[PDB]
């Protein structure tokens, strides 16, 4: 039993939304622009 440890499993997937959504929503410049 470990509530504090149980949360780590729920956040590990939540916080991932950042790394898994950083390069996605990230826009890049155009060639010779």
PDB file of N, CA, C and O in Angstrom:
ATOM      1  N   UNK A   1       0.827  -1.201   0.000  1.00  0.00           N
ATOM      2  CA  UNK A   1       0.000   0.000   0.000  1.00  0.00           C
ATOM      3  C   UNK A   1       0.864   1.256   0.000  1.00  0.00           C
ATOM      4  O   UNK A   1       1.781   1.390   0.811  1.00  0.00           O
ATOM      5  N   UNK A   2       0.566   2.175  -0.914  1.00  0.00           N
ATOM      6  CA  UNK A   2       1.327   3.408  -1.001  1.00  0.00           C
ATOM      7  C   UNK A   2       0.659   4.439  -1.888  1.00  0.00           C
ATOM      8  O   UNK A   2       0.958   4.530  -3.079  1.00  0.00           O
ATOM      9  N   UNK A   3      -0.248   5.216  -1.310  1.00  0.00           N
ATOM     10  CA  UNK A   3      -0.962   6.246  -2.058  1.00  0.00           C
ATOM     11  C   UNK A   3       0.013   7.171  -2.777  1.00  0.00           C
ATOM     12  O   UNK A   3      -0.152   7.466  -3.961  1.00  0.00           O
ATOM     13  N   UNK A   4       1.032   7.627  -2.054  1.00  0.00           N
ATOM     14  CA  UNK A   4       2.036   8.518  -2.624  1.00  0.00           C
ATOM     15  C   UNK A   4       2.703   7.880  -3.838  1.00  0.00           C
ATOM     16  O   UNK A   4       3.081   8.571  -4.784  1.00  0.00           O
ATOM     17  N   UNK A   5       2.844   6.558  -3.804  1.00  0.00           N
ATOM     18  CA  UNK A   5       3.466   5.829  -4.903  1.00  0.00           C
ATOM     19  C   UNK A   5       2.469   5.594  -6.033  1.00  0.00           C
ATOM     20  O   UNK A   5       2.851   5.461  -7.196  1.00  0.00           O
ATOM     21  N   UNK A   6       1.187   5.543  -5.684  1.00  0.00           N
ATOM     22  CA  UNK A   6       0.134   5.325  -6.667  1.00  0.00           C
ATOM     23  C   UNK A   6      -0.050   6.548  -7.556  1.00  0.00           C
ATOM     24  O   UNK A   6      -0.386   6.428  -8.735  1.00  0.00           O
ATOM     25  N   UNK A   7       0.173   7.727  -6.985  1.00  0.00           N
ATOM     26  CA  UNK A   7       0.034   8.975  -7.726  1.00  0.00           C
ATOM     27  C   UNK A   7       1.130   9.116  -8.776  1.00  0.00           C
ATOM     28  O   UNK A   7       0.893   9.627  -9.870  1.00  0.00           O
ATOM     29  N   UNK A   8       2.330   8.657  -8.436  1.00  0.00           N
ATOM     30  CA  UNK A   8       3.464   8.732  -9.351  1.00  0.00           C
ATOM     31  C   UNK A   8       3.137   8.055 -10.678  1.00  0.00           C
ATOM     32  O   UNK A   8       3.682   8.415 -11.720  1.00  0.00           O
ATOM     33  N   UNK A   9       2.245   7.070 -10.631  1.00  0.00           N
ATOM     34  CA  UNK A   9       1.847   6.341 -11.830  1.00  0.00           C
ATOM     35  C   UNK A   9       0.829   7.140 -12.639  1.00  0.00           C
ATOM     36  O   UNK A   9       0.719   6.975 -13.854  1.00  0.00           O
ATOM     37  N   UNK A  10       0.085   8.006 -11.956  1.00  0.00           N
ATOM     38  CA  UNK A  10      -0.914   8.816 -12.627  1.00  0.00           C
ATOM     39  C   UNK A  10      -0.332  10.090 -13.208  1.00  0.00           C
ATOM     40  O   UNK A  10      -0.869  10.643 -14.167  1.00  0.00           O
ATOM     41  N   UNK A  11       0.767  10.556 -12.625  1.00  0.00           N
ATOM     42  CA  UNK A  11       1.422  11.774 -13.090  1.00  0.00           C
ATOM     43  C   UNK A  11       2.390  11.471 -14.228  1.00  0.00           C
ATOM     44  O   UNK A  11       2.528  12.257 -15.167  1.00  0.00           O
ATOM     45  N   UNK A  12       3.061  10.327 -14.139  1.00  0.00           N
ATOM     46  CA  UNK A  12       4.019   9.921 -15.160  1.00  0.00           C
ATOM     47  C   UNK A  12       3.398   9.982 -16.552  1.00  0.00           C
ATOM     48  O   UNK A  12       4.092  10.216 -17.541  1.00  0.00           O
ATOM     49  N   UNK A  13       2.088   9.771 -16.619  1.00  0.00           N
ATOM     50  CA  UNK A  13       1.374   9.804 -17.890  1.00  0.00           C
ATOM     51  C   UNK A  13       0.882  11.211 -18.208  1.00  0.00           C
ATOM     52  O   UNK A  13       0.779  11.597 -19.374  1.00  0.00           O
ATOM     53  N   UNK A  14       0.583  11.977 -17.165  1.00  0.00           N
ATOM     54  CA  UNK A  14       0.103  13.344 -17.332  1.00  0.00           C
ATOM     55  C   UNK A  14       1.232  14.266 -17.786  1.00  0.00           C
ATOM     56  O   UNK A  14       1.132  14.924 -18.821  1.00  0.00           O
ATOM     57  N   UNK A  15       2.305  14.307 -17.002  1.00  0.00           N
ATOM     58  CA  UNK A  15       3.452  15.149 -17.320  1.00  0.00           C
ATOM     59  C   UNK A  15       3.963  14.863 -18.728  1.00  0.00           C
ATOM     60  O   UNK A  15       4.530  15.736 -19.385  1.00  0.00           O
ATOM     61  N   UNK A  16       3.757  13.633 -19.187  1.00  0.00           N
ATOM     62  CA  UNK A  16       4.195  13.230 -20.517  1.00  0.00           C
ATOM     63  C   UNK A  16       3.521  14.074 -21.596  1.00  0.00           C
ATOM     64  O   UNK A  16       4.058  14.245 -22.689  1.00  0.00           O
ATOM     65  N   UNK A  17       2.341  14.598 -21.279  1.00  0.00           N
ATOM     66  CA  UNK A  17       1.614  15.417 -22.231  1.00  0.00           C
ATOM     67  C   UNK A  17       2.425  16.602 -22.715  1.00  0.00           C
ATOM     68  O   UNK A  17       2.160  17.147 -23.787  1.00  0.00           O
ATOM     69  N   UNK A  18       3.414  17.004 -21.923  1.00  0.00           N
ATOM     70  CA  UNK A  18       4.264  18.134 -22.277  1.00  0.00           C
ATOM     71  C   UNK A  18       5.320  17.724 -23.297  1.00  0.00           C
ATOM     72  O   UNK A  18       5.428  18.319 -24.370  1.00  0.00           O
ATOM     73  N   UNK A  19       6.099  16.703 -22.956  1.00  0.00           N
ATOM     74  CA  UNK A  19       7.147  16.210 -23.843  1.00  0.00           C
ATOM     75  C   UNK A  19       6.550  15.609 -25.110  1.00  0.00           C
ATOM     76  O   UNK A  19       7.155  15.665 -26.181  1.00  0.00           O
ATOM     77  N   UNK A  20       5.359  15.034 -24.982  1.00  0.00           N
ATOM     78  CA  UNK A  20       4.678  14.423 -26.118  1.00  0.00           C
ATOM     79  C   UNK A  20       3.820  15.447 -26.854  1.00  0.00           C
ATOM     80  O   UNK A  20       3.050  15.099 -27.749  1.00  0.00           O
ATOM     81  N   UNK A  21       3.962  16.713 -26.474  1.00  0.00           N
ATOM     82  CA  UNK A  21       3.196  17.769 -27.109  1.00  0.00           C
ATOM     83  C   UNK A  21       4.005  19.035 -27.307  1.00  0.00           C
ATOM     84  O   UNK A  21       3.460  20.079 -27.659  1.00  0.00           O
ATOM     85  N   UNK A  22       5.311  18.942 -27.077  1.00  0.00           N
ATOM     86  CA  UNK A  22       6.198  20.090 -27.230  1.00  0.00           C
ATOM     87  C   UNK A  22       6.604  20.274 -28.689  1.00  0.00           C
ATOM     88  O   UNK A  22       6.400  21.339 -29.270  1.00  0.00           O
ATOM     89  N   UNK A  23       7.178  19.228 -29.274  1.00  0.00           N
ATOM     90  CA  UNK A  23       7.611  19.273 -30.666  1.00  0.00           C
ATOM     91  C   UNK A  23       6.412  19.243 -31.609  1.00  0.00           C
ATOM     92  O   UNK A  23       6.504  19.669 -32.760  1.00  0.00           O
ATOM     93  N   UNK A  24       5.288  18.736 -31.114  1.00  0.00           N
ATOM     94  CA  UNK A  24       4.070  18.651 -31.912  1.00  0.00           C
ATOM     95  C   UNK A  24       3.497  20.036 -32.190  1.00  0.00           C
ATOM     96  O   UNK A  24       3.340  20.435 -33.342  1.00  0.00           O
ATOM     97  N   UNK A  25       3.187  20.767 -31.123  1.00  0.00           N
ATOM     98  CA  UNK A  25       2.634  22.100 -31.273  1.00  0.00           C
ATOM     99  C   UNK A  25       3.692  23.131 -31.608  1.00  0.00           C
ATOM    100  O   UNK A  25       3.385  24.310 -31.796  1.00  0.00           O
ATOM    101  N   UNK A  26       4.943  22.690 -31.683  1.00  0.00           N
ATOM    102  CA  UNK A  26       6.052  23.584 -31.998  1.00  0.00           C
ATOM    103  C   UNK A  26       6.119  23.860 -33.498  1.00  0.00           C
ATOM    104  O   UNK A  26       6.174  22.933 -34.306  1.00  0.00           O
ATOM    105  N   UNK A  27       6.117  25.138 -33.860  1.00  0.00           N
ATOM    106  CA  UNK A  27       6.180  25.535 -35.261  1.00  0.00           C
ATOM    107  C   UNK A  27       7.606  25.892 -35.667  1.00  0.00           C
ATOM    108  O   UNK A  27       8.371  26.437 -34.871  1.00  0.00           O
ATOM    109  N   UNK A  28       7.956  25.583 -36.912  1.00  0.00           N
ATOM    110  CA  UNK A  28       9.289  25.875 -37.426  1.00  0.00           C
ATOM    111  C   UNK A  28       9.228  26.864 -38.584  1.00  0.00           C
ATOM    112  O   UNK A  28       8.212  26.994 -39.268  1.00  0.00           O
ATOM    113  N   UNK A  29      10.340  27.577 -38.813  1.00  0.00           N
ATOM    114  CA  UNK A  29      10.439  28.566 -39.891  1.00  0.00           C
ATOM    115  C   UNK A  29      10.451  27.920 -41.271  1.00  0.00           C
ATOM    116  O   UNK A  29      10.574  26.701 -41.397  1.00  0.00           O
ATOM    117  N   UNK A  30      10.325  28.743 -42.306  1.00  0.00           N
ATOM    118  CA  UNK A  30      10.322  28.252 -43.679  1.00  0.00           C
ATOM    119  C   UNK A  30      11.696  28.421 -44.321  1.00  0.00           C
ATOM    120  O   UNK A  30      12.528  29.207 -43.868  1.00  0.00           O
ATOM    121  N   UNK A  31      11.941  27.665 -45.402  1.00  0.00           N
ATOM    122  CA  UNK A  31      13.212  27.716 -46.131  1.00  0.00           C
ATOM    123  C   UNK A  31      13.398  29.029 -46.883  1.00  0.00           C
ATOM    124  O   UNK A  31      12.548  29.425 -47.680  1.00  0.00           O
ATOM    125  N   UNK A  32      14.516  29.700 -46.626  1.00  0.00           N
ATOM    126  CA  UNK A  32      14.813  30.969 -47.279  1.00  0.00           C
ATOM    127  C   UNK A  32      13.750  32.013 -46.949  1.00  0.00           C
ATOM    128  O   UNK A  32      13.419  32.861 -47.776  1.00  0.00           O
ATOM    129  N   UNK A  33      13.219  31.943 -45.732  1.00  0.00           N
ATOM    130  CA  UNK A  33      12.198  32.886 -45.313  1.00  0.00           C
ATOM    131  C   UNK A  33      12.713  33.882 -44.294  1.00  0.00           C
ATOM    132  O   UNK A  33      13.219  33.497 -43.239  1.00  0.00           O
TER     133      UNK A  33
END
